[PDB]
Design a protein around this ligand. Structure first.
Ligand SMILES: C[C@@H]1C[C@@H]([C@H](O)CC2CC(=O)NC(=O)C2)C(=O)[C@@H](C)C1
Ligand SMILES: [K+]
Ligand SMILES: [K+]
Ligand SMILES: [K+]
Ligand SMILES: [K+]
Ligand SMILES: [K+]
Ligand SMILES: [K+]
Ligand SMILES: [K+]
Ligand SMILES: [K+]
Ligand SMILES: [K+]
Ligand SMILES: [K+]
Ligand SMILES: [K+]
Ligand SMILES: [K+]
Ligand SMILES: [K+]
Ligand SMILES: [K+]
Ligand SMILES: [K+]
Ligand SMILES: [K+]
Ligand SMILES: [Mg+2]
Ligand SMILES: [Mg+2]
Ligand SMILES: [Mg+2]
Ligand SMILES: [Mg+2]
Ligand SMILES: [Mg+2]
Ligand SMILES: [Mg+2]
Ligand SMILES: [Mg+2]
Ligand SMILES: [Mg+2]
Ligand SMILES: [Mg+2]
Ligand SMILES: [Mg+2]
Ligand SMILES: [Mg+2]
Ligand SMILES: [Mg+2]
Ligand SMILES: [Mg+2]
Ligand SMILES: [Mg+2]
Ligand SMILES: [Mg+2]
Ligand SMILES: [Mg+2]
Ligand SMILES: [Mg+2]
Ligand SMILES: [Mg+2]
Ligand SMILES: [Mg+2]
Ligand SMILES: [Mg+2]
Ligand SMILES: [Mg+2]
Ligand SMILES: [Mg+2]
Ligand SMILES: [Mg+2]
Ligand SMILES: [Mg+2]
Ligand SMILES: [Mg+2]
Ligand SMILES: [Mg+2]
Ligand SMILES: [Mg+2]
Ligand SMILES: [Mg+2]
Ligand SMILES: [Mg+2]
Ligand SMILES: [Mg+2]
Ligand SMILES: [Mg+2]
Ligand SMILES: [Mg+2]
Lengths: 185, 51
RNA sequence: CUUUGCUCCACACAAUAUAGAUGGAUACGAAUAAGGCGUCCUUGUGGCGUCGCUGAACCAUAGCAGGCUAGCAACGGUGCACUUGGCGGAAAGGCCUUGGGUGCUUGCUGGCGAAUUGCAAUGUCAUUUUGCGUGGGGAUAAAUCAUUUGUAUACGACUUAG
RNA sequence: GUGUGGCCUAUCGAUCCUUUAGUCCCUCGGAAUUUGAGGCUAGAGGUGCCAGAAAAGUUACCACAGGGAUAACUGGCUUGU
RNA sequence: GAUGCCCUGACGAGUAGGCAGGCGUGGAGGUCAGUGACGAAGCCUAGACCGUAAGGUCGGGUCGAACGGCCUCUAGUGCAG
RNA sequence: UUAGUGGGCCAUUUUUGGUAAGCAGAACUGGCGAUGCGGGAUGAACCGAACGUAGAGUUAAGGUGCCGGAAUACACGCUCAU
RNA sequence: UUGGCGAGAGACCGAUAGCGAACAAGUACAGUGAUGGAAAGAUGAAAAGAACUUUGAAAAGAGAGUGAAAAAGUACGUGAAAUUGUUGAAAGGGAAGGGCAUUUGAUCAGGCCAGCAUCAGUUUUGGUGGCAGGAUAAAUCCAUAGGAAUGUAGCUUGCCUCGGUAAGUAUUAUAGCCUGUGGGAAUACUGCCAGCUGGGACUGAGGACUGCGACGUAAGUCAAGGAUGCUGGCAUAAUGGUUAUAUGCCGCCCGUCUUGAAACACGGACCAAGGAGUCUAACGUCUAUGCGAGUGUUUGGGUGUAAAACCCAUACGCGUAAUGAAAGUGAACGUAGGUUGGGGCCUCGCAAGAGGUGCACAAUCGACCGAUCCUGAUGUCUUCGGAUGGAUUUGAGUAAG
């Protein structure tokens, strides 16, 4: 016998591979597993872990978010890398030049980047240009902006959204939501 | 692949501890202490034997 | 009294299968704050001596698993078969004894043999039970059913008779 | 300075409905005015089974689902009596 | 065969329950130009082999017309009550 | 994010009711329930110890006349019970 | 459009299924009646459905024959299990069955079984050597001072089986002892050795090299990152498997509810076959996939090799805006803010670090939009308008989707 301080046979609880059966994503993972092992660059370890993430943990990155990032001081000529999809945003007018590396470009995003003189590249083309992540800038989309997150942690006084199909005057605005009808929240 | 005990395997003893060759040669496990002629005080003995 | 059936003995030849051979189960009785053995005599609940302190004994024990031979010394030891007389009924089935015969003798001294089972392999040696075939002896019935009885009885059983 | 009831520790009440106070404000959806009705904010009318059904018995004529979660024997622990 | 190969260290009880990887059945798409009247399927078999196991495979007997492996799809898919 | 559960029961110590209970009710911990294994002849809960499949060694608790593996061990006393 | 008539189909069921009904089935049968309502498919290609002989009163048997086969005979494809007969094998003192192990018998598939030496790993049991400590063991022993009694010699009395002694006395004498003090050792006990050797048992994982060492002047060698060498017998039921039995020890009956089941709690005589988390509408989390500020071809139209596949306009749904009961109003002071953290990147450093930039995300202070409560400008259908500025108030909000 052994007085176990921890739980035995506990899996790490991190993905160690994409759950996806996309062949081409599996090739990207074969590449970045190689570079992460054989270089010392922190970048490659990060990009490798990002290729494992589920769709909800790879939120899209608009081109306005890329544009905002290149306004950072000393950042205008960095390769922006998005381990995921770059979407268009018609809320910006002037987009800078720049090279963006990503898994996917929407048709509109690829148009807007190219029209400004830029270049959209795959993550394997990034590997050859920047094997040690040289001169890159990793961007992540916003995670906590999903509709589902509005509803997490629902409870008295917590200020979260109820799970509700129909909204209006008659749907969950009475006893419990105002002092005049029993009490508020 | 196989833990050898220094305390049995003489080769492994020497690997871990180069002084073991010296220690054995000079027989430091059986060192004679130098004779001294110290005697306890009366008081020490008188209390030792006291009823 | 004819499948020559039964039995005993001797001898083969098969099988059988072992509650577990592997030098020897080697005989007083009684006491234990007492005895054993020897010895002596007034024979005793005797005198004297001696022993124990475990069988760690005693006996046996050498030889091709024990061969083939030649002598010496004793006339002893021992095996086998056969005889003589006796004792043993607790479950005697054994103990002892006479006599001659025939082997063996490591009591002592010789000669010849042994190999190759290859550097070990239980390396086979005992003891049951039964069959079967040879030769030699020996013996020459019952019970049951059916019938019958009523001292017996549910049926078996029992008790009778032929 | 003290004072948003009682020196402190108990002394009390949702939704729906009604009703009052307040704003004299929003609505009556073809367009107006005036009544009426409806809303918004704060109270009261009460649920004492007090997180709040609107509620009398009998069955030996009895029924069903179950219960050894539970009585009416024995047995067991206990031994007051 | 990188879902591979390999090195190192630690650990292993389990009802209710959770999750994972597998085994088996009817039927569907694909494939093996798969097996088969020179014997398919089924059944019997103190004969053999593989797998921790679900199970799989082979021989012998019986028999007479169909049936399997693999990649997938799908369910009226596994019994001791 | 979702399952099961929402009858518990026992031991040591603290503890209430009760003459008491293998009774009723609390406290802290450990257990049984859900758990085999060695020991306590036997036994849910006690003692030891928690379990992949094997080999060797050593031990726990409990034992060593015989049943039964292991001293009819050693040592000082006590005890004879119709 | 679960009826009628006529068609075509199916990832549907395959005779306990599928309609109750594959068949002379709404039949046979039950009930006064309304009603209730089964079971039951398969010889063979072909009846070629067994002439004839023989036993028997006959049914039938035995032959003969037909047939590819009667191991297809109408009691008819295959022909399981429960349960049964016969034969063979085996065991059996108040159940049987099971586990671990081996003996014995039977049976069966594809190098097998051992011995010694030298090593390594783990361990068990002996022999023996050197040291350390302590009151530098204590003792014994030797020397010396003092002492007494369970008083040795001597002596004195009394007994005198005539040395047996009884009592005095005497402190080493013809025995000895005790205590103290000196002296020199030894031994025990405890501990240490990178001291040396003998015996026994279990293991031999790994599979080119690579390491750390040791020994040697080197060359090399080695017991140093896991067993080799030498030898024998057998080559098959010999080892081993299986199986039955025997023997030692152990082993209550499963399923279930329960704090607690072997229970004197419930279900279960046996066997086959059937037999229980499904489909749908709308949803939550999570995951995959497509496209992405959008997205969704399938109501319908076009087309077709025809329920498929292919193509498509307008809408509509959800999303891209909230808030308020409502009338309504409706999201940048700023580099879409500040502060603290923050992966990664950039610069400088052999590196440690130092500095810069900091996405996601977390905490916090602000700002923006709507509600509520205040404030109430210029104006003016003089009661409308509602600027500006506020507030321990509030929202399922904004703040590069
Ligand atoms: C006794 C009287 C009436 C009572 C109340 O309206 C009774 C209602 C409650 C409800 O929600 N639904 C009903 O159908 C009955 C109330 O409020 C009291 C103060 C005054
Ligand atoms: K363990
Ligand atoms: K109540
Ligand atoms: K009633
Ligand atoms: K009493
Ligand atoms: K197929
Ligand atoms: K719960
Ligand atoms: K619950
Ligand atoms: K336990
Ligand atoms: K026990
Ligand atoms: K222990
Ligand atoms: K006994
Ligand atoms: K039917
Ligand atoms: K047939
Ligand atoms: K056997
Ligand atoms: K039950
Ligand atoms: K009952
Ligand atoms: Mg109107
Ligand atoms: Mg209540
Ligand atoms: Mg009860
Ligand atoms: Mg487990
Ligand atoms: Mg089906
Ligand atoms: Mg066949
Ligand atoms: Mg069988
Ligand atoms: Mg046919
Ligand atoms: Mg089913
Ligand atoms: Mg069944
Ligand atoms: Mg069951
Ligand atoms: Mg629940
Ligand atoms: Mg409750
Ligand atoms: Mg309950
Ligand atoms: Mg109780
Ligand atoms: Mg339970
Ligand atoms: Mg007891
Ligand atoms: Mg014993
Ligand atoms: Mg039917
Ligand atoms: Mg046939
Ligand atoms: Mg048939
Ligand atoms: Mg049968
Ligand atoms: Mg060794
Ligand atoms: Mg064997
Ligand atoms: Mg038993
Ligand atoms: Mg109960
Ligand atoms: Mg039970
Ligand atoms: Mg009982
Ligand atoms: Mg019941
Ligand atoms: Mg029953
Ligand atoms: Mg039944
Ligand atoms: Mg079935």
């Amino acid at each position: 016998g052994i007085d176990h301080t921890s739980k035995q046979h506990k899996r790490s609880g991190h993905r160690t591979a994409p759950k996806s059966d996309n062949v081409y994503l599996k090739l990207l993972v074969k590449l970045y597993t190689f570079l992460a092992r054989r270089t010392d660059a922190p970048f490659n370890k990060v990009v490798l872990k990002a290729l494992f993430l589920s769709k909800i943990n790879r939120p899209p990155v608009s081109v306005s978010r890329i544009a905002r990032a290149l306004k950072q001081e000393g950042a205008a000529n960095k390769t922006v890398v998005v381990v995921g999809t770059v979407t268009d945003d018609a809320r910006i007018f002037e987009f800078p030049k720049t090279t963006v590396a990503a898994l996917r470009f929407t048709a509109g995003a690829r148009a807007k980047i190219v029209k400004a003189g830029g270049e959209c590249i795959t993550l394997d083309q990034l590997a050859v240009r920047a094997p040690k992540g040289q001169n890159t800038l990793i961007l992540r989309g916003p995670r906590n902006s999903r509709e589902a997150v509005r509803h997490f942690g629902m409870g008295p006084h917590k200020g979260k959204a109820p799970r509700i199909l129909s909204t209006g005057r008659k749907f969950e605005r009475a006893r419990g939501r105002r002092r005049s009808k029993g009490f508020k929240v | 692949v196989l833990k050898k005990n220094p305390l049995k395997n003489k080769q492994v003893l020497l690997r871990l501890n180069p002084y073991a060759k010296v220690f054995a040669a000079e027989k430091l496990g059986s060192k004679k202490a130098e004779k001294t002629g110290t005697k306890p005080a009366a008081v020490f003995t008188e209390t030792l034997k006291h009823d």
